[PDB]
Design a protein around this ligand. Structure first.
Ligand SMILES: NS(=O)(=O)c1ccc(NCc2ccc(B(O)O)cc2)cc1
Ligand SMILES: NS(=O)(=O)c1ccc(NCc2ccc(B(O)O)cc2)cc1
Ligand SMILES: [Zn+2]
Length: 257
């Protein structure tokens, strides 16, 4: 019953998921002036050439584009990481208006949306085991601003009318997630959590500095999705973001000067 309404939204989550008030929760605000350049950080290595997308699912919170994670087909390495992390799914968080929607913020600025490419450390064997570990996941976060269309997003936008309501899924083969990346792979990183219940503290966050641009029309189509199931009262899927959480005993690291 958690969600994003007044009665079940982020300020309520702690009642069922007490780690919501934990020591390494996400998202956070990234203060660009107080992030520390870390010369030990390596370039990201994003290897998505053999990615195999399978399906797109409206899960009642967002939509997930799911991948075949039974082999190292689409992996993230390098950066702050000391293992190989398989891509399992990506999804977005977005607003009702262009002035909100991102989870992370930058000098307190919200973006219109945020893309999360979710990867799990292969040494743990499955995603469910990985989320139990302090280094189980690596989530690659990418901000979306509204301006020119993102060509590589359009295939996603166009299928959304077929997964309008909670529990719908559709085929989604042969999608190339490389078309969602910005040019630069400069990033910030810090230890954090899942941003939805169960809010587990298992994520090495890697947030790219350079946003991608999407069109107003693309993000308008995100906002036509529904949180509800078919045959239930229509609740638009908008404002499915958790606000910034206390930084606590963390300093964010920058890959760039
Ligand atoms: N956030 S949580 O602690 O898991 C939680 C919060 C609320 C509830 N139940 C009450 C509730 C559930 C859903 C909605 B709604 O607008 O769709 C409103 C009220 C159940 C669990
Ligand atoms: N928004 S986010 O921090 O990227 C993010 C939030 C939640 C999730 N996964 C949610 C979740 C957690 C555990 C299991 B399981 O199989 O035990 C399945 C799904 C994945 C990413
Ligand atoms: Zn997310």
């Amino acid at each position: 019953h958690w969600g994003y309404g007044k009665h079940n939204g982020p300020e309520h989550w702690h009642k069922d998921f007490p780690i919501a008030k934990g020591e390494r929760q996400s998202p956070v605000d990234i203060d660009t002036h107080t992030a520390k350049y870390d010369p030990s950080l390596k370039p990201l290595s994003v290897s998505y050439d053999q990615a195999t997308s399978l399906r797109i699912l409206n899960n009642g919170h967002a939509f997930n584009v799911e991948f075949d994670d039974s082999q190292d087909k689409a992996v993230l390495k390098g950066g702050p990481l000391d293992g190989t992390y398989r891509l399992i799914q990506f999804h977005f968080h977005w607003g009702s208006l262009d002035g909100q929607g991102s989870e992370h913020t930058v000098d307190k600025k919200k973006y219109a949306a945020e893309l999360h490419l979710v990867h799990w450390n292969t040494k743990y064997g499955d995603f469910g085991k990985a989320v139990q570990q302090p280094d189980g996941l690596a989530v690659l976060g990418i901000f979306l601003k509204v301006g020119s269309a993102k060509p590589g997003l359009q295939k996603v936008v166009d299928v959304l009318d077929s997964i309008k309501t909670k529990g719908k899924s559709a085929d989604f083969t042969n999608f190339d997630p490389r078309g969602l990346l910005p040019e630069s792979l400069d990033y910030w990183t810090y230890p954090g959590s899942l941003t939805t219940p169960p809010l587990l503290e298992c994520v090495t966050w890697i947030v790219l500095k350079e946003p991608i641009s999407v069109s107003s029309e693309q993000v308008l189509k995100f906002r036509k999705l529904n949180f509800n199931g078919e045959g239930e009262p229509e609740e638009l899927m908008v404002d499915n973001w958790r606000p910034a959480q206390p930084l606590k005993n963390r300093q964010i690291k920058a890959s760039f000067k």
